[model samples]
Target: IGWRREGIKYRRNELFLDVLESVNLLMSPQGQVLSAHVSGRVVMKSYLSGMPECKFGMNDKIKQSIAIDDCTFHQCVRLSERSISFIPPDGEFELMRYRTTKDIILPFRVIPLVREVGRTKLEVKVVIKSNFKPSLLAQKIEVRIPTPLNTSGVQVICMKGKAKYKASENAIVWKIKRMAGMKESQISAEIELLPTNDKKKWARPPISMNFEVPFAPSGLKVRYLKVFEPKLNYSDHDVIKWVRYIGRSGIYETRC
Candidate 1:
């Protein structure tokens, strides 16, 4: 019989984070008693014309735009683009931290893993047991993990490692890292002490609060998830692609 696989897809890091959060809620169903801190960097591709300034209002059909005007700052210096936007813009990176732990049903729970965004294939590594151990029937078992939310401004690459089991009682480990075509201006995470009074010996946790990003899609390429590995004979044709055209539609006309 042919091998079949099932998984989750990650676009920016948030997509993966969303999946993790969604799964945690599903597995527990009870609740996330302790909050996880979601802290990361928002790396900009270019230097901001000035400190980013933002405006917000509630009007269904209302749209607005603003610009920065200041010459006392260098193009690449920090605290120089404090014109209209809040966070630094351009190739610089900014820290974005927030928190959120909500229990809600996710859309991809019913979808097969093979068709998911960032998830491509599943590989299993098993160890031969002694005559004393019982033989497992199935060769592979599939499970889905939740993706993160893009509360952070810039969308960075995040990926899952290949599945491999160890000896002894047998255990598996998966590593997560930034994807290709992604730069440092794209991803960052740090561990710090919470501002609250619950000082425990726990190392660090994912941030829970969610924050808003620049929302600019300019210069942003529409990248998709393909096969887990090129050596593995996986092709881009096997993955999903975005629909809208960037040029003809002028979807990426200017910076927001």
Candidate 2:
């Protein structure tokens, strides 16, 4: 009764699909991948009239191609036939949630070279390289490099992006607008640490990054979407549709 409320209509109906994939990674200082995976979701926003039966298909090869595990779907989806058949809600909702571990593609790799020249001075060099295809570009890349507490000033020798030391956070904030594939950006600096009252060791924190790319690292792709109605047969031309893929960082940490 609620979905099919009387006197409810729209002049032009539209349907939107959003595929969100969050990539998580943890790597050792030697560039060995300890752990990596992707958690993804299929979200839908529908504004069509009447109760429409929708069929969504992805390139899963009937669960043979991708190593998808621990998957869940909305109640409207019919899982008996191994196909996505559902009557979506009126507005916005999540269609499915899945986790993939096979063939995980990492978009960025960080290489750090640090050496303590003396007690009061240190040398730090960091490089970030993109591993994605050249066509796909990452946006809003922010890399956080940890620094020592007894730091007075830093002389940055080489930097492609903006690198500034935040005294309150005790870390260098590197921000870049865009990064392309197979491109490497570096930051090298010499730090001058002030003398402290007590000699205490500084524990360096891991390098963390945040960025967004229009790619699915898990190799998931939409194959087709079909809509069926009781009164009429709907074609692709009758509906307005949109699809997008987004891959972002989730707990993306790397040891320096």
Candidate 3:
């Protein structure tokens, strides 16, 4: 009945599902969190021979507490309760998509102080703090701070991590290997600018960050997954299934 013809057979049988999640944040220059949220999707790749029904479950209590703002499912899915029952497609496909805006855990917070000292000099001070739990640390945190186009030299007075002036890109790249909760780091620098004939006012761009936290910001999890067939010919022990949760930054911008 579906797109695949009858008598379709395959030697291998496996299913892989990954939870692709991303978070976005908007913050003020003083390190006040303005708004944040996370968007995620369950993507899967199936290599099974016959059509099969799958039942997926999640932490009902957690899901209810969060009150997911939006959720969408594929065409093969049937909805009765707050559950997912589907005969999945043969190849790669997205199982479902969801988004949450409440009770988000921001992993990092940045406080920036950028001041124009005079016509030919500028000073910048930035402090980044870890906001997650102490046990779970944010990793590979990189912050991009905008710099003037005519910047000629940069003197780093103090820094916890590596800070480099990228004149080609007109930005300062700050890299921190790891940051534990309740811990903070700072970077202070003085910039020397070369006088230019073009006196156009410099408009500072927003500060942006990139990093990966341990879990999704929405706290969503896969409670259980069950595979079913009418014949019951296949051995459940032999089947392979995998579930993973990934978190990354998306639209992580701050006005400075």
Candidate 4:
């Protein structure tokens, strides 16, 4: 399943490298960032013979513009100088672990407004904004706004997306299929609540978001990758490699 040979061709001589990142943000409704951080990893999948040694080259601008707080490598890795040295395994495995906190740039900004006009009605207005070049796109954007436990019904209106009240969850869900960069989409919801005998007020929970972006928020880049296997001495045309970068939300919440 790992390697294949067809006479003179090493058909399974390909390598795939993925740069994955997770964004953590705790924000306020007043457009203030309370706490923000980014954590990323370099994952690799190798399918070659003779246990080839791999080398990785990172951005030259690293340590100048993009400062990393802390980073660690896999047990099979060694730091020689500018490039990294390692021997990857057969299956999918992580290559490096890193984290950054300096000059954090948030990809998406969520502004939510929730007001209770009276005892029986609640008004919610939320705006989802993206900060990126217009050429990029993010998909599967889901924003969750908590509703009162006494909510009886809700009427939601939104553009470029779908909104529905989840009765079982007691929350309003707004989902976007695709979002172009540097654009804003909003949702308005009117919730009707039942007058309860209890005198306690509804404790508003945090609003959470989920999305998949095509780029990294921290501006981290990989300069190059060097893969060489001794003995076999495969040429450039004989081997193929791929590099991909992706970022997603993790514990991305805001106070409404």
Candidate 5:
């Protein structure tokens, strides 16, 4: 079994990022994470992405560890028994107990995406949200491409009238085509370089995107594109809508 470490410390109600369906925290007496925060995202990256309610709604399993490092005679200490407890015949006391923390490696599954068969190209249109939502606006949009053992192609799509297409080889196709022979993860996502160049000509910046991925064997797919499909929902406390998506590990994000 593989394992990794995660530093779980954040504001109340904040979502945690991890590679598993569950989460746990390691905190000091003050509650801030002693280690670094675990960096991750849900099935896909999105503006309001964070930890989903389905994964952490319950107070389930929580594993923790804290080490008492060296304590100096001049440092802070509690003489009262209530503040500090000693275990020993006379008194098992120490100066201090320092601590070092790390993440535990966990088994990971490959994120799922389809491979382009033949020369089939696909486009994923994201309607520029109305009312200018901030959370949804923060995430970077991407598309996944799956090519054959040594094939290459671009992973970008923009809807023009009725067709979604990849206009350039910058997406992913061109890179993989150069290496066409060994079975490797040959996929990429198009980074929206010019977000709003079509200004007055288009009301909502195209409202759609496109991708062009090459064909592969019956079973090969892409990985680590950091792309996600967005979803909208209403918040009872406020009138604003919440956005989220599924990550590679099958976890959902209410906010990230």
Candidate 6:
């Protein structure tokens, strides 16, 4: 693909490659995995002066063995047999997108115990277990548990973090500042409902999990991202390259 320069400055060459993946998961009420997949995006930002050719590369062993379901690239990407050659622009752009289904890693496991106490009151207890490394911590964790339509009030007791009933959202939102790895957190709530027609049953919606982690769940890594420019006299010591990886929740839901 052809390259286009956008600015005029004799600045040092810089490149940033970020591997961002979104994990989508759905589980049955019995905690069985129903549907799970990972959608990954390789984004690049270049600030080089001239048109520089960058060859993106990942782990050769993973590229040889793993099955990528669908692949798409930007307009500037020149697809080769095993390499991606591009004369990149001087701005932010997405390089490629990949979808993978196998070898999915789940960071948290959730168990819900909901009992209908008579007809006016409900008992609910939820347990969430972290499965990541102990060295890593999950932050900004929020669990959304659906409530019945005729619910009046909710009393919640959480082992860690805070929980409150959100009438605006029609659910009880439990939030945690940070959660350590290999540890479990629990929240128990008692919901009170007004007496109404008992003709229909409440459809228990799945629990949505939200978290922020620093590592990729799929364990995907880039082996090398090499840059080369013909016009500029650049060396390895002069140019700067940065790579980052982030894994977050994308429709991570658990059945109740």
Q: Which digits, one per residue and each the tens of the lDDT, describe model 1 over residues 17-131?
A: 0101111212112232332211111222322122222211111120222221111222333332122123223233322211222221111111111121222222221111111
Worst 10 residues of 1 by lDDT: 247-256
Candidate 4 stretches with Cα past 4 Å from truth are 1-12, 49-51, 60-64, 197-199, 235-238
Could you list the CA RMSD of all candidates, in the order they appear? Answer: 23.9, 2.6, 3.6, 3.6, 22.5, 2.5
What lDDT, from 0 to 1, does candidate 4 have?
A: 0.81
In model 3, which runs have C-alpha deviations exceeding 4 angstroms?
A: 1-14, 47-49, 60-64, 115-120, 133-140, 157-161, 176-183, 195-202, 233-239
Compared with the true structure, what per-residue lDDT tens digits does model 5 show for residues 197-224? 3333211111111211122111111221
Cα lDDT, all candidates: 0.21, 0.81, 0.78, 0.81, 0.22, 0.82
TM-score of each: 0.23, 0.89, 0.79, 0.87, 0.18, 0.89
Q: Sort by lDDT, best first: what order?
A: 6, 2, 4, 3, 5, 1
Which consecutive 10 residues in model 2 have the weakest lDDT in total? 1-10
* Colliding pairs, model 3: none
Q: TM-score for model 5?
A: 0.18
lDDT score at residue 234, model 2, on the 0-100 scale: 55
Using TM-score as the yardstick, the better of models 2 and 4 is 2
Displacement of the residue 135 alpha carbon in candidate 6, Å: 2.2
Tens digit per residue, CA lDDT, model 2, 26-100: 999988989999999999887765667788888775342566767899888878636799877777889999998
Candidate 1 accuracy as TM-score: 0.23
lDDT of 3 at 119: 76
Residue by residue across 1-256, what tens digits does model 4's lDDT show? 1332323334668878888989899998787889988899989876655556677877634453577788888877876636688766666788998897767668789999888876889999999999887898988999999998889999999976898899999898999988988999999999999988677877788888999888766667776667676667675446678888889988889988
Clashing pairs in 6: none
Which of the two, 1 or 6, has more lDDT? 6
Name the lDDT of candidate 2.
0.81
lDDT of 3 by residue, 1-256 (tens): 4633445445666778878889899987666778888998989787665667778887545423454788998888897737899878877889889988887767777788888876788988878787777887777889888888888888875457788888888888888887777788888888899887665888788888998877677777776667776654664444577777777789888888
lDDT of each residue in 38-145, candidate 6, tens digit only: 888988987765666778877434432455777899888887638788877677899999887877778889899999889889999999999988998988899999
